[PDB]
Amino acid sequence: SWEVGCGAPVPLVKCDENSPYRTITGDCNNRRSPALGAANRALARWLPAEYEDGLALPFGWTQRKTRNGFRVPLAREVSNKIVGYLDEEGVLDQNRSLLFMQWGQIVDHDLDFAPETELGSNEHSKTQCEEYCIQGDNCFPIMFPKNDPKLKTQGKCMPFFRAGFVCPTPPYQSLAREQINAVTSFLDASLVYGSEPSLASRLRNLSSPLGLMAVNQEAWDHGLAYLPFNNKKPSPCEFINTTARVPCFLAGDFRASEQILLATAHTLLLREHNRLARELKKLNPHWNGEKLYQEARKILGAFIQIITFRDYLPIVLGSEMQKWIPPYQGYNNSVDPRISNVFTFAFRFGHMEVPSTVSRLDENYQPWGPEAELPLHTLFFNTWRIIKDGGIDPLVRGLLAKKSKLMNQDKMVTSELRNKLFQPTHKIHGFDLAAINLQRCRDHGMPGYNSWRGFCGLSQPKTLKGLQTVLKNKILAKKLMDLYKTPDNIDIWIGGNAEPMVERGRVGPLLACLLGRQFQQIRDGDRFWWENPGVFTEKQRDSLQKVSFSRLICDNTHITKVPLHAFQANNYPHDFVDCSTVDKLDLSPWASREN
Ligand code: HEM
Ligand SMILES: *[C@@H]1O[C@H](CO)[C@@H](O[C@@H]2O[C@H](CO)[C@@H](O)[C@H](O)[C@H]2NC(C)=O)[C@H](O)[C@H]1NC(C)=O
Ligand SMILES: *[C@@H]1O[C@H](CO)[C@@H](O)[C@H](O)[C@H]1NC(C)=O
Ligand SMILES: *[C@@H]1O[C@H](CO)[C@@H](O)[C@H](O)[C@H]1NC(C)=O
Ligand SMILES: [Ca+2]
Ligand SMILES: [Zn+2]
């Protein structure tokens, strides 16, 4: 045999079998294989990697090297010809609120992060990749096709750096390149608490013995907490407005400030931790700071699991929910809890749910000021519009009262993401998330569309007419065949997202299978699953059943009118109720009596 386990990075396996709490790293969840689902290990491979050279070079790397006898098309050409649209009229989801998109991003950030390799530390190819567009080592530029308007305004390419991989990064390894998942595979609120001990400690308030998370000491939201600032430079949140000079937030996850509504959701979760810790200190004044932090952390982890599996997944997977995620039957320590490489592209279905604008609404759910509605691209790495423009409440009202974009075969990804994406150290609102996703599919050695159809027990179309039948769309099938020449070569991100959505769902059959399998494993493979007997008491579980995003908003903002079903498209005032009528989380079952 060859390398049975290349785990030289993070070899520290020091497990307490008795602990009623998760580790921060995710180590020690599975007793027989304690690294399973831990952060900073390889993404799982459900199918073998597919590289040009068998090992590490992406398809599209070598101009002369075909995939199955055809050249792979430029990611940006696919983006332009298939993914782009002009007309935002009629593109909204009539039955999903903007919170539906935003929770997807939150769950995805809890589960997976494959950060770009660190070879740009005092290196030219940081700006040289950008400046000269020369492919090599970790520089894998997204080249513009001849007719691209960006060729006219932005030079020859968009910079792109290859993802980090296991058995460290600049030299070779044991057969095929395996990308890293930097966060815990468990649905465990690692995006609030961190997946590394250093960060996890930095986020905590170790001054008081109250188990609190650190809060901003420079700004308040009408007396409610902000995340602390990340005081490190250069800051993209300062870069986008050097007058306001408001830094990015420091959260459990590196990406928290990528856009204003993600920063908003991270703010609600932090507030909820501190709220729970204060309630628990009342019930149990004898609990020290560590106990308070762990108990509140464990409740917030359960909150995220319940909203996700009870409220979110059913309205993503539709008819496919029951097929892939049956009712819970307890912890199965034979299940692989690791996030798969392909899942990290499957869950980018959210890219097609992001609409072109964000609104701030007032207490009557009416436009907040004269520029209430803003273009999404102005809100990438934007914290100043929170600190200096009315705090999170107006944005939270927009998350409730405004709609997700609907996935449309003729209108896939808004130009706000497809032409105006901002990336840190890049200085322009000029990147293309769709092109980045296609390039990253290839970076990660993804098997093509038909390999995944076969994995999912679905038909593998070989001809234009077969692709038309699967996509229920003759013009989309023709564009994909003109670019890819065979459905075997269609990148998984675009192939999965091209399929028409399942009934009562928001993804097609291929994505429902890949997502459904992953979420089944996330639940069944987790020793700390909230509903696993022993994790919580039966009385605690009865209290936890009553959690809602609506109550989270009521408890952690000055919003007093909320819908009961926050993921549905809700209109004010008909679909909104007073917070008074909304079930609370009853923490009385956490009262701990020794005497
Ligand atoms: C305005 C909203 C959003 C922005 C600005 C955004 C931006 C990005 C960026 C820049 C990446 C990295 C691309 C790469 O380097 O390969 C990414 C990755 C990703 N996005 Fe989004 N995204 C948004 C919404 C969402 C939503 C709604 C979902 C899910 C429902 C989602 C799921 C993901 C996933 C799973 C990844 C891969 C994470 C990893 O393993 O590294 N995104 N996003
Ligand atoms: C950068 O941030 C500043 C600081 O908020 C923005 O200025 C505000 O700008 C408008 C003028 O268009 C005023 O009506 C507001 O009342 C200002 N507030 C303050 C405190 O100055 C500015 O618009 C931002 N610029 C960019 C390009 O984002
Ligand atoms: C820590 O909590 C104490 C106790 O309330 C508070 O006064 C202090 O501001 C907190 N510090 C941070 C950084 O949150
Ligand atoms: C536990 O997981 C294994 C591997 O997926 C599977 O064979 C078995 O059916 C599972 N156990 C139960 C009780 O479902
Ligand atoms: Ca996690
Ligand atoms: Zn207020």
DSSP codes, 355-379: -SEEE-B-TTSSB-STT-EEEGGGG
Distances (CA, A) of 169 to 10, 119, 198, 226, 507: 14, 8, 22, 36, 35
**H-type alpha helices, 235-342:** 236-239, 260-283, 289-306, 313-317, 321-324
Q: Compute CA distances 376 → 96, 256, 323, 381, 476, whole Å.
A: 18, 16, 36, 11, 27
* DSSP result, 260-275: HHHHHHHHHHHHHHHH
Say if ligand 2 is within 6 A of residue 1 CB.
Answer: no
Query: Which among 108, 161, 345 is the best mutation to test ligand 1's pocket, defined by most ligand atoms within 8 Å of the CB?
Result: 108
**Dist. CA 503–CA 506, nearest whole Å:** 8
Q: Backbone dihedral region of 472: left (phi > 0), alpha (psi from -120 to 50 degrees) or beta?
A: left
Q: The CATH number of the domain where 273 resides is what?
A: 1.10.640.10
The span from the CA of 219 to the CA of 285, in Å, is 29
Q: Is the CB of 368 under 6 A from ligand 1?
A: no
Q: Considering only CA atoms, which of 229, 230, 228, 224 is closest in space to residue 205?
A: 228
Give the domain range for residue 365.
Answer: 1-595
- Which value, in Å, is the radius of gyration of the alpha carbons in the chain? 23
Contacts of 155 by beta carbon, 8 Å cutoff, 6+ apart: 133
What DSSP string runs through 406-428? Answer: PPBTTB-S-HHHHT-EE-TT--S
Pocket of ligand 4 from Cβ distances under 6 Å: 332, 334-335
CA of 523 to the centre of ligand 4 (A): 13
- 174 annotated as ligand-binding: no
Query: Which atom of ligand 1 is nearest to 339's Cα?
Result: 40
Distance, in Å, from the CA atom of 565 to the CA atom of 99, rounded to the nearest integer, reads 11
**157 in ligand 1 pocket by Cβ < 6 Å?**
no
The single-letter code of the amino acid at 433 is L
83, two tokens: 């993914």
Ligand 1 atom nearest the C-alpha of 43 is 40
Contact between 164 and 177 under an 8 Å Cβ cutoff? The reply is no
If you measure from the C-alpha of residue 348 to the centroid of ligand 1, how many angstroms do you get, rounded to a whole number? 6
Q: Which of 557, 567, 576, 581 is nearest to 270 (CA)?
A: 557
Q: How far is the CA of 208 from the centre of ligand 1 (A)?
A: 36
- Index of the ligand 2 atom closest to the CA of residue 389: 5
Q: How many residues does the chain have?
A: 595
Among 62, 47, 50, 38, which Cα is nearest to 166's? Answer: 38
Q: Which ligand neighbours the alpha carbon of 426 most closely? A: 1
Atom of ligand 4 nearest to the CA of 336: 5
Annotated binding residue 351: yes
The per-residue DSSP string of 446-498 comes to ---HHHHHHHTT-----SHHHHHHHHT-HHHHHHHHHHHSSGGGS-HHHHHHH
CA distance 485 to 477: 11
Nearest CA among 401, 358, 405 for reference residue 382: 358
CA 105 – CA 496 distance, rounded (Å): 18
Q: Is 443 in the pocket of ligand 1 (CB under 6 A)?
A: no
Kindly report the number of other CB atoms within 10 A of residue 308's CB atom. 21
Nearest-ligand number for the alpha carbon of 332: 4
Structure tokens given for 113: 């992060």
How many C-beta atoms surround the C-beta of residue 6 within 10 A?
15
Q: Determine the Cα–Cα distance for residues 98 and 396; give it in Å rounded to an integer.
A: 10
Ligand nearest the Cα of residue 210 is 3
Atom of ligand 3 nearest to the CA of 217: 13
Q: Measured in angstroms, how far is the CA atom of residue 107 from the centroid of ligand 4?
A: 25
429 known member of a binding site: no
How many domains does the chain fold into? 1
| Angle, vertex CA 127, rays to CA 126 and CA 131, nearest 5 | 135
Q: Is the CB of 243 under 6 A from ligand 2?
A: yes
CA dihedral of 275, 280, 281, 286, whole degrees rounded to 10: -160
Cis status, amide bond into 234, omega within 30 of 0: yes
Residues with CB under 6 A from ligand 3: 205, 207-208, 210, 212, 214-215, 217
For a mutational test of ligand 3's pocket, the pick from 205, 229, 230, 278, i.e. the residue with the most ligand atoms closer than 8 A to its C-beta, is 205
Would you call 109 a catalytic residue per the annotation? yes
Say if ligand 1 is within 6 A of residue 101 CB: yes
CA of 336 from ligand 4 middle (Å) equals: 10
Q: How far is CA 549 from CA 142, 181, 347, 506, in A?
A: 39, 28, 21, 20
* CA–CA distance, 191 with 256 (Å, rounded to integer): 8
Q: How far apart are the C-alpha atoms of 108 and 299, rounded to whole Å? A: 19
Angle at 221 between CA 215 and CA 225, to 5 degrees: 20
Distance 237 CA to ligand 3 centre (A): 25
Token digits of residue 200 = 């996890």
Instruction: Kindly state if the Cβ of 374 falls inside 6 Å of ligand 2.
Output: no
Q: Is the dihedral of CA 52, 53, 57, 61 positive or negative?
A: negative
Name the nearest CA neighbour of 302 among 282, 321, 320, 276.
276
Nearest Cα residue to atom 27 of ligand 2: 241
Q: Does residue 388 line the site of ligand 2, with CB under 6 A?
A: yes
78 three-state secondary structure: helix
Q: Which residue has its alpha carbon closest to ligand 3 atom 13?
A: 214
Resolution for this PDB entry, in angstroms: 1.7
CA of 310 to the centre of ligand 6 (A): 31
Residue with the nearest Cα to atom 7 of ligand 4?
334
- Are 577 and 525 in contact by the 8 Å Cβ rule? The answer is no
**Does residue 440 line the site of ligand 1, with CB under 6 A?**
yes
Report the nearest-CA residue for atom 13 of ligand 4. 332
What's the rounded Cα separation, in Å, for the pair 318 and 503? 6
DSSP, collapsed to helix, strand or coil, labels residue 99 as: helix
Alpha carbon nearest to ligand 1 atom 32, residue: 348
Ligand 1 pocket check for 113: Cβ under 6 Å:
yes
Q: Is 486 in the pocket of ligand 1 (CB under 6 A)?
A: no
